[PDB]
Design a protein around this ligand. Structure first.
Ligand code: HEM
Ligand code: HEM
Ligand code: HEM
Ligand code: HEM
Lengths: 306, 306, 306, 306, 306, 306
């Protein structure tokens, strides 16, 4: 009845992230593609069963939603909110549609992106394209294991999927994306122990620092948030490394899924604006966000029903 | 909760299909084998975990049911209905038991089949034995990706498993088998574009032709059927290639699972007898059915407790 | 609702079994460690996604429970009961905590064990440590496939997890461990046929001997038990081989999970004390138990909510 | 500098053996296929780099040689010699061309066999086609590890490749094929220890029996032959299991390569005709030859030069 | 003389880096060249045995004169621009080539990062391409690409400098060209028409017969026979690359040869044509946007530098 | 040409090191086993083709050589020379035979060791048995990638095989073994930067430290040796981690192969006794040798010919 898209699925060794804007007069072409995206994913993906693990998660931005559909909107859908901190800024950049494409091989991702874009040619303008790759033992460009504390099982379901709070849109999710570029030269000037105090975990072994030693402005400290009832508010991250050596571009493509954007936005506010105990997240002293967009990823049957 | 046999499990790289008839006075031997087939599957399969993926699905034909069992019969169980179209015919051939054996390796299939047939020696007569193999990127002998639109998840369960409409047999399914031989000489004389018009999908990329270009007598058009309620009727297919180059035998072994045989039967009727828009399915111009049988595959517990 | 530990997960190619006692005054250090074991499991295991398959099952013994926790006790928790047969004895040995660590590679097991033992230094005393390895096609040191008749799916859940009969501890299980050393010299003086009569299955093919020829004092005969309800009583076994060639140590590390210890204890009594028709299990003529301990493995959330 | 065909390559998981005779008028078609066979092998094989390991060895029989080529003949090429022993017979059957096709997957073998036979349609009559498969840990249908004592490295080159003794044909080899069908019922009536005596090695562990225990009519004893120079005479065997359970067809497809047919013929004589100390090879009491043919497999460059 | 890894096969990932040496950057580059093999080992050893990381370093003609004082490789000269009537092969700056391959992109990226870290401020990047395997060794035109590469001793003879230039024995010459394809134009051809452009069957990769193969097909024009009569061969490690948003669908051409004359002869035939052919038809769908020639010295040459 | 044992082959994921002494009177049994060790290796190893990678290198100590054999001895065969430094000592411990067993899986190593020791029972006394395992990305227990600068190709052959300097023993090698235990508590007290100064390489990335920063008492500095004629003296190391968590045993099993013990001894003297610039190798401040033995590993044909 409420079949979600593959928002709960694990990290893979390859990804493509595509973000586009819909041109004036391109809505009908988009709606037609949306109704077919599941068929296209199967068309390509079936060629590589059992090990291909191809998926595509399609998201739709707030303004786009109003152009495409009449009737109810998801309760939490709004444009990404720019955060202008005293030192660091989280920019909002244009994006109407997100395609988060994952597989165990880049070819599958590329083949599917080709089919999607082929259908949208002349109706959309590309805003961003990133080809992500796994880096060693699930490391990011800063050299730390990245994704460790993601929720799993029932916990992930509860953290990520819209439920009875917005019944018309149950099985959907909200995705926030941000493309970060790192200052690798600066970061490499820190000792490993200083890097560990920025993140909040040991570098090689990935063991969390004890509470008596973890700084209040470490990344793990600032992105740990408790809800009304003492429980952790969780998001599901599918961050991937990307880059270009000749351009000195060493990045993290951030994508986080959550059942309400309020959770992800709380984490961002703490990072960028800081708290009474932390000026800002120290990870931002080595990381610049160059995109920022929010999407709603509907249940799969919503897109079919078109 | 009734425990199904492995009728929902995916395609594998190797398969053995075995169809036998039960000789007069063979019933007791067969019943004792039926009660042991799961333990035989584990005895062989356990040797190859975790990657062996050995399974065996056992089906029983309509006439055999009546020789083996007193009491309730599955509601949809009848002999395969011969279809004598104007040009093409779907023959009915004898078969009392089906063993649908799958694994990631042929040795495991062969070892299990050996143990089964050793127990049935003198009680059964073999009618058909086919050793199927994966062909490139999930292709069939016509060079097309085959299996793409199979249901998955909840949809597959709904489509395949008997439920409350026949509660004594909940968790069962119906399998139809047909062995097809292809005229490869004739097929390979067609252009790719002509072959695509026969199937209804692009050959290399496996993308479905749009509705405005897809012929009414293409295979995909004829095997797409909407139910009374406008709901699509679905089957689960585990087709495998087979052949012998020296005898010019290039085959598709068709096996389709469904909650009721009426669904599969409607598809065959459309293919063999045609519609208002189509004389018959053009695939049949290059494919000849040489067997045809219908089996019920009971819930696993049913076999266990007999 | 309650999340079990990974007690239902399959065999892997590597394991570490670590049994320790809690030293006088070690209680608080152990409680802090128990609250963090899942975190540690993730810290190490995430590095090896997706194929590492690291898990850790943590068990607590009867005496230790009382030292660590106030309030309710699991209903079936008691010290391992020594069985002093006429010929063979099942010894009870000290053990307060069990860590059953599994992965597809030993390095992941060793890394996690290192992190747990580093946190427990000064608070526990090691009692046994075994590094298990897969031996050919899931064989044990006697040369027989080992694990074949383990329950799977729903039958496993039913057989292993505590439910509404003890609702405060639902999602838990009971583990019994015994380290066995084999007399391989004596074993290898037996013909294959004689070995088959000891075990109750064919050696190469792992097919069960038929009821006609299966000895009453065979291993499989004695460990096949039914309730007064008539159903099979099942346990889940994760036995691993281990050894040292220079010391002539050829071993089977037995670990069996069950929803109540009574099931496993019944099997042990049949083995060591025999039945009307069998003096004891013949496997014990070639196998000596040198440890014996019983643990409760709580639901995951019990440990966390510490 | 002559380039051999892939006669020194290892065993693979899948094989196809194809034997055909050349029809009246078929010689030109055959010579054109021979000139292209390496190019066909690449055409198919490159699709599955790095792991497909596709190869084709092409052999030519004695009578066919003379129909296809003028000028010199290989020194040792003659028709297979039938051996009519007092109990068992090594039969000779027709065969002009051999294709020995190997890969890690059957699809590659089948695709190459399809391209080959497509070229040859109307010029050849198929005599035999077998699809071989790996059986557990390099076992044959008798349950023994099969291939152990094959030569490797320098020793294999010396044993298999024609050298200065026949310089115009240096880089070639001689292949003897025999299809054997086994009496599995008779074989399984022997204890394992009796089977071990027949073969001359331990069944499970593959360790050779000591000289003190090994019978003179054991298979290993009879196929161990020393030359006049005290030199061990060696062949390279690529035999594969095959079968059909319904037909009770459990087979060994024997293929042995050697630098001269006299080595292989000596072994056959010892097996079928026996020695002073053994009437015949006991393996033949459970194994019946139903084909026998001898081929020369030229250097790769010889075929290309056509 | 130890060659660099120019004979090694295709891998699933590659990075191609081309840089120019800034005025005054010569000493830094010499230093790096002396260390490139130690960097390769430093990264590569981490992923033994399946990483397959390699780096081949090439030096252009102008750079050679700037870096070294002694003799020049006899064939070393700037890439020769070809201005054909319709199509042009452009010559673009490039002093150093790093051709980095592995089974995973992370290893490629890590090594590139270390190389470029050492060169920062001494070199200017000219081109960086991240190549990926596309299905069954296909290129962006949908054809299997690499089939007729030489192997074994033929590859060695075709690719490595020998006695004809003894001071440079073990070296090779690499030509690179980055090509972008007009996929829209290409996809408007029938498959049959595309086959006539290439000269091989699309799906099966079988060469067209010499009757059917057009004179202006790519295979016909790149098939070159020397005075001798024997085929002139090169070794190609072409990789796909692209960007879907930018409509960039590319083939990164790299071809290795013992003398540049061979590759240059093929280029002349393609762009300038022959008696029979105005130009290679593949160029109607393919534009070269880079063109550079490099000498890749023996490994000992680079190790022995100041 | 003498055929070496597998002394040049790469590191594997699993290893067993077995060191025994020969009891008085066990010489004949030992000689018989030495003549069979290659047959035993094949017997087990063939079961796991193609990926088992099982090998066994057999070494003989100086005192043992003189008990087993008569006639000429290898020129550099002597007992391990104890090194009594001011601070650190390298002990000499008994060992007459070494079996260095490697495979991709421990079961294969264990099965072969079982067969070898089965044959030697009652003739030998075990002295050491270590079961080594790969640790992450080729790391040792100190957390550094270990094996990076091993020689490969021709350089490896030159460094490790006896040649014309001792022609009767050409194709042999010398192995030195030392079992090291590490003081992990002390090591973990160092910053990563301080550990890098002890080793001489970067910890995560395995890049060698610059010659300006690399300390003179770093491990890499002291084990880098040039000969009188300017050549680098190299050894081939197949070190493996081992340990036991409950005993707080974290080790490195050192094994180095070289064509003369003089190279390995020179390295050891520099480490333990120091140089004009370094008191001793800083690695020894965290590593204690607990065994030390020297073996000659003869050419394979020497063993076979006994
Ligand atoms: C510059 C970009 C980023 C990098 C390189 C990065 C890296 C990391 C690393 C290494 C960890 C620790 C291991 C783990 O549990 O994944 C972590 C944890 C986490 N990150 Fe980030 N991160 C980035 C941006 C973000 C952003 C933008 C958010 C939220 C809006 C976020 C939310 C989190 C959360 C919730 C955790 C888990 C904290 C916990 O409960 O322990 N991260 N990240
Ligand atoms: C010496 C230690 C042991 C060895 C080497 C061993 C070996 C085996 C083998 C080879 C089988 C047959 C294949 C399979 O179903 O797993 C088996 C079955 C079994 N074993 Fe054991 N076992 C040992 C100890 C135990 C112990 C201590 C128990 C219980 C307390 C146990 C309970 C079982 C059960 C329940 C079965 C399945 C019987 C059936 O239902 O068919 N085993 N074991
Ligand atoms: C757009 C750029 C190119 C593409 C997509 C391309 C594609 C192909 C394909 C599909 C084949 C047939 C299969 C094979 O043998 O690899 C082929 C063959 C070949 N190509 Fe190209 N190629 C390109 C550029 C070049 C260039 C620039 C050269 C030489 C300077 C070249 C030399 C060859 C050679 C020598 C063969 C083998 C011909 C034979 O002996 O059958 N290619 N290429
Ligand atoms: C105590 C335990 C030992 C440890 C943990 C260890 C560890 C290491 C490490 C991490 C490296 C750097 C990476 C590489 O392998 O190239 C290295 C290099 C080396 N080690 Fe050791 N080692 C040990 C003992 C020894 C011994 C006893 C010797 C010689 C007798 C030795 C000889 C070498 C050599 C020759 C190199 C390469 C130096 C170079 O040319 O860069 N090691 N070792």
């Amino acid at each position: 009845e409420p079949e979600p898209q593959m928002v709960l699925s694990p990290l893979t060794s390859a990804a493509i992230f595509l973000v586009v804007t819909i041109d004036s007069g391109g809505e009908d072409t988009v709606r037609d593609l949306l109704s077919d995206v599941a068929s296209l994913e199967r068309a390509v993906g079936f060629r590589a069963q059992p090990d291909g693990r191809l998926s595509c998660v399609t998201g739709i931005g707030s303004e786009a939603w109003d152009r495409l559909f009449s009737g109810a909107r998801p309760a939490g859908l709004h444009p990404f909110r720019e955060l202008d901190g005293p030192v660091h800024r989280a920019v909002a950049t244009p994006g109407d549609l997100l395609f988060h494409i994952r597989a165990s091989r880049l070819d599958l991702c590329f083949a599917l992106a080709t089919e999607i874009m082929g259908r949208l040619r002349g109706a959309v303008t590309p805003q961003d394209e990133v080809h992500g790759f796994k880096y060693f033992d699930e490391r990011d460009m800063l050299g730390f294991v990245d994704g460790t504390e993601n929720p799993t099982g029932a916990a992930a379901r509860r953290a990520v999927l819209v439920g009875a709070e917005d019944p018309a849109f149950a099985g959907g999710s909200y995705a926030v994306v941000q493309k970060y570029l790192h200052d690798i030269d600066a970061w490499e000037g820190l000792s490993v122990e200083a890097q560990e105090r920025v993140i909040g975990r040991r570098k090689m072994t990935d063991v969390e620092l004890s509470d008596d030693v973890k700084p209040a402005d470490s990344h793990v400290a600032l992105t740990s948030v408790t809800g009304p009832d003492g429980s952790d508010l969780e998001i599901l991250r599918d961050n991937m490394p990307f880059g270009s050596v000749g351009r000195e571009e060493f990045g993290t493509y951030f994508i986080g899924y959550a059942r309400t954007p309020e959770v992800t936005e709380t984490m961002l506010e703490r990072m960028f604006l800081g708290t009474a105990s932390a000026p800002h997240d120290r990870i931002l002293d080595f990381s610049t966000a160059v995109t920022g967009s929010l999407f709603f990823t509907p249940a799969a049957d919503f897109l079919e029903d078109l």
